[PDB]
Paper text:
The structures of Bhe_BepA, Bcl_[name], Bqu_BepC, and Btr_BepC exhibit all features defining a FIC AMP transferase as described in the first chapter and elsewhere. So far, it has been shown that [name] AMPylates Rac-subfamily GTPases, Bep2 AMPylates the host intermediate filament protein vimentin, and BepA causes the AMPylation of two unknown host proteins of ca. 40–50 kDa size. All members of branch 1 are predicted to catalyze AMP transfer (indicated in green in the cladogram). This has been verified for Bro_[name], which AMPylates the switch 1 loop of small GTPases. Very recently, it has been shown that small GTPases of the Rac-subfamily are the target for [name] and that two residues in the extended flap are critical for the exquisite target specificity. With the use of modeling, this finding was rationalized by suggesting that they form two salt-bridges with Rac-subfamily specific residues. Bcl_[name] FIC were grown from a solution of 10% w/v PEG 20,000, 20% v/v PEG MME 5500, 0.1 M MOPS/HEPES-Na, pH 7.5, and 0.02 M each of sodium formate, ammonium acetate, trisodium citrate, sodium potassium L-tartrate, and sodium oxamate. Data for Bqu_BepC FIC with ADP, Bcl_[name] FIC, and B11C_Bep8 FIC were collected at 100 K on a Rayonix MX-225 detector at a wavelength of 0.9786 Å on beamline 21-ID-F at the Advanced Photon Source (APS, Argonne, IL, USA).
Residue numbers in the entry: 18 to 106, 121 to 312
The structure:
Amino acid sequence: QALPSHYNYPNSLTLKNKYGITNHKDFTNKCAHDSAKAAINLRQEEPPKKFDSSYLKYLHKQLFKETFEWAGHTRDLPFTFADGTVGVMIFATGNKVQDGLKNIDKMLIEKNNLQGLSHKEFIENIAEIFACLNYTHPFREGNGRTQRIFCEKLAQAAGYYLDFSVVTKERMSEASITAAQDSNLEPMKKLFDDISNPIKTAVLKECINSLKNIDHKNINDCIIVAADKGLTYKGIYTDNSPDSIILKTDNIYIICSKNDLAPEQLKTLKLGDECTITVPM
């Protein structure tokens, strides 16, 4: 019998791995390290001429070849381990993996690997590819690390630098869930806009480096987003970093540089108060 359980050690939720490690914490730590060493080397590599699922598979192989026998292989196809057993079987099921990869490949061909596009089209399309990869979940494990590097490389070849380190866990989760369940890509587009705009990335970075907590919660449990030029926000001034105010609105936190606000606007603000901020264009 091919079985999904043949991916794991007997009676365990630990994946079979080239380290022989059954302890889940120890396994996770070692995999994290091996794949982080591979990632740093991949970041420096020349990007490919064409971005497609074969490059995605290459990245997964490079990231996980020291960890998994199946590095570079997709989960829809049975995989035969060296021990003789065969494994099979975050949501596309079966043939849906191949369809998802096909659709991403078609998108990338049609949009010239996202090169030569307007900024708005670059954002709509990289967000859509990230969401499609989410849904496709083509690998047994390591999808997130592989998707991220793929998008980093894609952005690099198009002239942008992506900094995923300014995205909170809560922001990534809510953006991903909303894209998949409500078909709403707006949170994902805003995420990619922030992390590809060096000014917005720096605003978010200074916030993260200054504050462990926002509004009585760990910052990683808060959706924090950069303020956009031209927008008016109304909410509660809940926290203050040296450079920025933090405005709570519709359950999220807008990080607004004090450099973008006028003295008149600044004198107006008191921590805990409701306020209305317009960011100039």
